Design a protein around this ligand. Structure first.
Ligand code: HEC
Ligand code: HEC
Ligand code: HEC
Ligand code: HEC
Ligand SMILES: [Ca+2]
Ligand SMILES: [Ca+2]
Ligand code: NA
Ligand code: NA
Ligand code: NA
Lengths: 357, 125, 376, 125, 376, 354
């Protein structure tokens, strides 16, 4: 049951037959060899992914599916902070509500509708067997049921130990099985004493049982537009990615430009970074934060382009109170954080850590 | 009471300088001027910087990372002064140095020292 | 028996054990109530000073307010704000003087007004609660000026502006009776009634001289604005009671706080705030001990409580500590607050029975003035 | 050291609260902060106003008028605090009142209280 | 035998008897000399603080200087002036911050300069002497800034103006050696030499690492500017001596202030200013006591006096009080100054016999820092 | 000897033969019945006195001679303040140097020269015997010796207990022989705690042996010209009285407009007041010191004129530090002060208080 449903999702996950032209599965964009992110080059490098039509580019970077199972369903907490959900703008409530979206998205897998997806499933005798044993006879004949059933199988598959093994050096260090290097231990200390802990730690205080390095909140850190991605996506030179405000039901103008805080697990191997894939290097993503803190001119320069970071896409509702910590990260502390963030890489991707350091 | 004796943490009174979470506090316990173990008193501004320490909790046998944080923008409370230095390192390792007025990121640029809070932020390692 | 700190350790242990998360933040003080008490520490004339906001019930500090040189605290009887006239200098104790009034939100303690007082006009003196006073409608703050001559400043808290100074005769203290009226005490032993409109000389009316040349009235009379009752001890414990509830000064029967034999054996009032008045209970409280004629500012170990009507002693408490100032909550079953400058501690007593309930120590350097709101 | 007992003037130590001239001093003895019995410490400003008292001198059995003068424009010294009140009257008799910060006339309009001197201005009566 | 207030009563008595007239006035402090000592009182982080100017020979307070929040005192070695970097706010501890440097005449104690520091650039920390420092010619005041990053502010005391901030590596403290050069201690365990012009990137040079990551160097090293001797104890009483008199760091041999048996028996340094250095005697004084290793800021009751050259112990004094900070006069037959933050008292010892000679008490609320001028 | 010297001075003091027309003696202007001041009405009232010639008026108020013998000889003291001397601008060193100046002043006694003074002394058999017995035979033949010896007799006369009897109610209270009235004592308290005692007391501190309510210093308290007195003086509308600066040898501009602190003894009976008799009432004189302290409109107005006091004749070197006390005298204290001042009247002038 919990075994079988996941097993069926394992199969759907790698099945390109869920795309219009049968070129693309979840695995194509969310590649298990790359911590469930897209190794493919498109017109905006690795910043955005190309759909089943071989031509359409999305407008946001493909996020890891590792540890996405730990994110709570979307909600507004009592302090009026929105939390949780899936997609960078929280517009899906949870894994299951998210799973059908790639399938119907003409920019992604591009099936025309539920009926077309059902007809695909119905063609494979193994799905008729697998789906019917879990959901009942004729499930594959009801396109709504079939589509919901697939979403649920795929959500269950992402909740297995294999998406979230907690077997990074950090996990091993938190068990006492090993120690951090001096560089990593200092990086860890910085992380917990600087402003990063205000956003990239499950809890405000106390100890998380399964830390995934995000509070699941939404913050506008004042990222510029990724021009080449935005051009590839075709959304227009006047388009504004409103972040969370794009979630249907969110009306509050103070939510414009806020994106879900991402889990920093596997961050070392899931470049490029931010919701639009704007920065290539991990160090760049960390150096961004100095722009709120440092008085040095270099702090306002994106080291990857040599030009200013850029005007924020949405110049309002910046998280200035967390961002403007009054303290700049020197290069010792940036190296220390890079070393720390690398300890967050799952055991199986430890070998990818070499071709980036 | 022997100031020179090894510090013995207790887990039963947060207003005393041997409360286990205060193992590297310097200043005043915010609970004593209208705050709480982990909240600031009214009118003061909560810093975002902190210094840490690994404090042994004699209730559970576990050591915890306590990230101190100052309540700023008021003259020093003068109530429940305490000074401990478990694992406290000199100023050149400021993430463990507790003479510094950790009032950075406090609203309104408040930098005066009123008192300090002792929230846990991790298990120690 | 469990102390506030120990309960706090247990709640904290349990949250950690339950894995309960909570956001570090700025607390709000609990809503102002009858049992709130304010201790002002003039700090033996230090250039900056503190006010302690205390929950009288719990014996807990729930906030603090900073002030400058010899600030005059005021508390709106209705509990809607607190304020002070305070004084700073551009270089600690020296350079340009700014006298100013600040109004505070009584739960966030944030300032809600900051009203400059032109030409440095505050009277700088050991804190006398009635040298600055709120009018009944909380719309106006009146502060005393001594230099160049007696005068009274009129501060509009509604428009957040200073208005003007009132020229007065040779008199002292300010007891507001109305939006436009207050009485002061004069050197000739009369009270002066001051009625100020918006413009011109106010209109000044003297009462009859009500004490002689050599009857000496303390610097800290009790005054209940809601009851219109000015309670004025003299050095020997003779207590003048003036009723000002009509708009004009009615003199009450003068009463005596110690007995002729106590007075014979050297019982005298003494301390700072020597007298409290409970409004509903109609009851005077007086700090006394055995002392020389000229040790009238020293701490006392005993409080006597007398009926304001009759003048009969209702209790004598052995306070069990050196007490300089007393005051009482204005609720039924009132607390009697006993502040020791020397111990820097507020001893909170049951006012009916005098037993020590709890105390708050570490209240500054030389706390002197206790204030309470009269909220009902 | 019994504070309610009649004050016992001595003529043998000016830094003590029972020194004869300090019979109606309120604050701090200027002699303990770098002044002397009748002069202000450096940096302070001497006021022209005083409150007067008649102080019994145990040594010649004569009574002297002491006009206290404040030394102003510094935070209070904190050294040798003394509060005596011989012949001290309430504020409406300001010539004999000593809660008043007697800094009128000080240079630079200095009004903050630092300490008090005790010069004789005449024979009493 | 006779106390200072007894000598004063007697002499006033005699002036009175002889009808001797004197004009009440503002005293001048006696000329600064070798036995003048300054005690700064950080007042446990109060927003306002005091320095006491003391004649160590008489043990007499000869003056005070007011300051704001965690000021850094400096005293010109030649006695010509004293100064501090100080911080004030518009409303006591809140509002607009103004950092500034004041220079004072050492006799009238009057401020002769008030130099604003723009953009509130001071490092607010428990007072470390060597976080604000005079260049040797007395023309420049250098102050450390921590936020947003380590920097040093350059203040021109001759032209009375702020000059600039200098960017430095991850380093701490400022030991000036020249009108345009100072050393800092870096996180990586080296010293950095900073040489700076009116404009341009400072020349920054690192020495080699002189201590392992696990040897901890205290926040109060003694630095004799005229000898260029930086005396840096570690938590264990291991002393680093760095000779900077050639203008470059030369590493002297380490000495152990405590013997191995003493260290085996838990002797370690502890307090605030744990170490003093007498230049003329080339002697190190360390505060030491038996203590657990993490009680390194508590007071100590013993001073070991060791020859800086050989590491030989010359004396171990039982101080007889809880001492946080020591310093010595730099004259022949020096005084050893032993300040108790607890007792708020400066104890003045003969540095040779360790004998207590006199003491000056009531030095504020939490006095911590002793500064002497080196006038020889 | 000191006796006979004083007795000689006593004769000279009331002798009008030391005036040009023999119409005027020292006693004419220093009337012993008026505390040694001028009762006589002139162009400018009692502000200034008329000389021997019938029309010449002085430009200063004739001061009392009582207590003048207690003033030290003119000197600059170690803190740089000039003290002592005689006349309102201290231009004479002492009583001896002062004595001769009225005799030779053309706007006063108007003797041509010392010779004419000696000649007048030679005409009186009583003077030949008086002078000769004290200064030797032929003293009156020599005009220098005669004039100087006359000045010595005058000075000795003014140094007798008669000019300085110390028998006012003030002196009797200080000797424990009587009490002040409540108001007098309030006045005394006010006098010693307010700024007055900064100038009108012999000493800075301690107890004065023979207090005359002056520290003998020079101060510009910022007084306006007395317009009628100045016009009567005929010294012109352009004229500036520089007070101490006019003493030969004082060159220091900080002294311009400074006048000697008068002794307040007998002040109740020697109106009008100030160096130029500008104020008729003592009360007015006291109120003048409110111009520096009070904010109130009434403080800028001379109550005697109903108009603003006027600009100081010398608008610099005002003793601002002493005068700007920060505190204003209310009616109650001004009353108290008058009361206290009146107690500084000598016994024999007690009858003159109305
Ligand atoms: C490339 C065209 C993709 C394929 C095929 C699939 N996904 Fe995807 N995924 C893609 C992008 C570009 C994004 C972010 C877009 C945005 O609007 O924010 C995503 C996001 C998800 C998420 C949410 C993760 C998070 O918020 O952290 C999940 C759970 C997810 N993707 C899973 C998923 C499944 C189950 C798929 C096949 C049915 C699948 N993806 C296909 C890009 C692409
Ligand atoms: C809330 C104010 C935050 C603070 C403080 C910090 N981070 Fe952050 N981070 C935050 C958000 C909302 C996002 C996504 C922003 C977007 O719109 O895309 C991020 C992203 C990162 C990343 C890239 C992660 C990824 O793309 O998968 C890194 C490496 C990262 N953050 C690190 C980081 C560090 C090291 C910080 C302290 C210096 C830190 N963040 C502060 C929210 C916030
Ligand atoms: C009216 C014409 C006078 C006659 C005749 C005498 N004096 Fe006089 N006296 C007069 C005036 C106007 C003044 C002050 C003038 C000035 O320049 O200030 C004086 C002053 C004195 C003083 C000094 C008093 C003091 O400073 O307090 C002395 C000692 C004095 N006068 C004595 C004196 C004698 C001895 C006379 C007979 C020769 C004499 N005066 C005549 C007015 C007149
Ligand atoms: C020095 C700064 C003084 C202070 C303060 C006070 N007085 Fe004074 N007084 C002073 C001078 C130099 C003079 C003469 C001024 C002049 O130019 O004529 C005076 C004069 C008087 C008088 C007139 C007496 C007379 O014989 O004419 C009176 C009554 C008087 N002063 C009294 C007085 C009082 C009561 C003061 C305190 C309010 C006071 N003076 C202050 C010098 C100074
Ligand atoms: Ca990515
Ligand atoms: Ca006159
Ligand atoms: Na790009
Ligand atoms: Na929306
Ligand atoms: Na001249």
């Amino acid at each position: 049951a919990d075994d079988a449903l996941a097993a069926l999702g394992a199969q759907l996950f790698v099945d390109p037959a869920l795309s219009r032209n049968a070129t693309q599965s979840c695995a194509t964009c969310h590649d298990p060899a790359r911590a469930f992110t897209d190794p493919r080059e498109g017109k905006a490098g690795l910043a955005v992914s190309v759909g089943d039509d071989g031509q359409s580019h999305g407008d946001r970077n493909t996020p890891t599916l590792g540890y996405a199972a730990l994110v709570p369903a979307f909600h507004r907490d009592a302090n009026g902070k929105y939390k949780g959900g899936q997609f960078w703008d929280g517009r899906a409530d949870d894994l299951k509500q998210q799973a059908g979206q790639p399938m119907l998205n003409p920019v992604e897998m591009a099936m025309p509708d539920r009926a077309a997806v059902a007809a695909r499933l119905r063609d494979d005798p193994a799905y008729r067997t697998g789906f019917e044993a879990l959901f009942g006879k004729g499930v594959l004949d009801d396109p709504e049921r079939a589509f919901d059933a697939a979403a649920e199988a795929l959500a269950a598959y992402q909740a297995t130990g294999e998406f979230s093994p907690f077997d990074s050096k950090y996990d091993r260090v938190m068990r006492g099985e090993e120690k951090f290097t001096p560089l990593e231990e200092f990086g860890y200390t910085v992380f917990i004493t600087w402003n990063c802990r205000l956003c990239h730690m499950q809890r405000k205080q106390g100890v998380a049982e399964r830390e995934t390095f995000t509070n699941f909140e939404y913050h506008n850190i004042g990222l510029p537009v990724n021009e080449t991605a935005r051009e590839a996506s075709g959304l227009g030179a006047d388009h504004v990615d409103h972040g969370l405000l794009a979630r249907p039901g969110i009306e509050d103008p103070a939510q414009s430009g806020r994106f879900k805080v991402p889990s920093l697990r596997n961050v070392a191997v899931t470049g490029p970074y931010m919701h639009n894939g704007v920065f290539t290097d991990l160090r760049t993503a960390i150096l961004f934060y100095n722009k709120y803190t440092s008085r040095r001119p270099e702090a306002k320069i994106n080291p990857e382009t040599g030009a200013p970071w850029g005007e924020p896409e949405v110049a309002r509702n910046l998280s200035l109170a967390e961002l403007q910590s009054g303290l700049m990260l020197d290069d010792g502390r940036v190296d220390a954080l890079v070393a720390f963030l690398e300890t967050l890489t799952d055991r199986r991707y430890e070998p990818l850590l070499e071709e980036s350091r | 009471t022997d100031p020179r004796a090894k510090w013995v943490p207790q887990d039963n009174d947060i207003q005393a300088c041997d409360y286990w979470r205060h193992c590297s506090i310097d200043g005043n316990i915010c609970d004593c001027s209208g705050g709480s173990l982990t909240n600031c008193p009214p009118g003061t501004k909560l810093a975002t910087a902190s210094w840490v320490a690994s404090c042994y909790n004699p209730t559970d046998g576990q050591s915890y990372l306590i990230a101190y944080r100052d309540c700023c923008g008021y003259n020093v409370s003068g109530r429940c002064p305490c000074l401990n230095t478990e694992g406290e390192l000199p100023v050149y390792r400021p993430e463990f140095a507790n003479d510094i007025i950790w009032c950075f990121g406090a609203e309104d640029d408040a930098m005066t020292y009123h008192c300090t809070i002792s929230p846990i932020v991790g298990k120690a390692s | 028996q469990e102390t506030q700190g120990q309960a706090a350790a247990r709640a904290a242990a349990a949250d950690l054990a339950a894995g309960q998360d909570d956001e570090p933040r700025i607390l709000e003080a609990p809503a102002p109530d009858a049992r709130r008490v304010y201790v002002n520490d003039p700090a033996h004339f230090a250039a900056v000073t503190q006010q302690f906001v205390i929950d009288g019930e719990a014996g807990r500090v729930i906030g603090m307010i900073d002030g400058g040189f010899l600030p005059n605290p005021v508390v709106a009887d209705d509990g809607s704000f607190i304020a002070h006239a305070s004084t700073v200098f551009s270089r600690i104790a020296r350079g340009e003087r700014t006298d100013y009034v600040e109004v505070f939100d009584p739960v966030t303690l944030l300032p809600t007004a900051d009203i400059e007082l032109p030409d440095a006009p505050r009277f700088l003196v050991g804190t006398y609660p009635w040298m600055t006073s709120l009018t009944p409608d909380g719309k106006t703050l009146l502060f005393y000026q001594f230099s160049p001559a007696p005068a009274v400043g009129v501060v509009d808290l509604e428009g957040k502006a200073f208005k003007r100074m009132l020229d007065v005769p040779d008199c002292y203290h300010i007891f507001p009776t109305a939006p436009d009226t207050f009485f002061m005490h004069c050197r000739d032993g009369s009270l002066a009634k001051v009625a100020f409109g918006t413009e011109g000389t106010p209109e000044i009316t003297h009462t009859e001289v009500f004490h002689p040349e050599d009857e000496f009235l303390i610097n800290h009379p009790a005054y209940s604005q809601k009851a219109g009752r000015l309670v004025w001890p003299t050095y020997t414990g003779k207590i003048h009671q003036i009723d000002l509830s009509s708009g004009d000064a009615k003199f009450l029967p003068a009463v005596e706080a110690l007995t002729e034999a106590e007075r014979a054996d050297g019982w005298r009032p003494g301390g700072w705030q020597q007298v409290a008045y409970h409004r509903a209970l109609d009851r005077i409280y007086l700090l006394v001990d055995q002392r020389d004629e000229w040790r009238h500012k020293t701490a006392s170990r005993f409080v006597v409580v007398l009926d304001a009507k009759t003048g009969e002693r209702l209790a004598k408490f052995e306070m069990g500590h050196e007490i300089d100032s007393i005051n009482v909550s204005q609720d039924e079953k009132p607390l009697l607050y006993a502040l020791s400058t020397g111990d820097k501690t507020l001893y909170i007593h049951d006012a009916e029975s005098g037993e020590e309930l709890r105390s708050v120590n570490q209240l500054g350097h030389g706390p002197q003035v206790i204030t309470t709101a009269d909220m009902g």
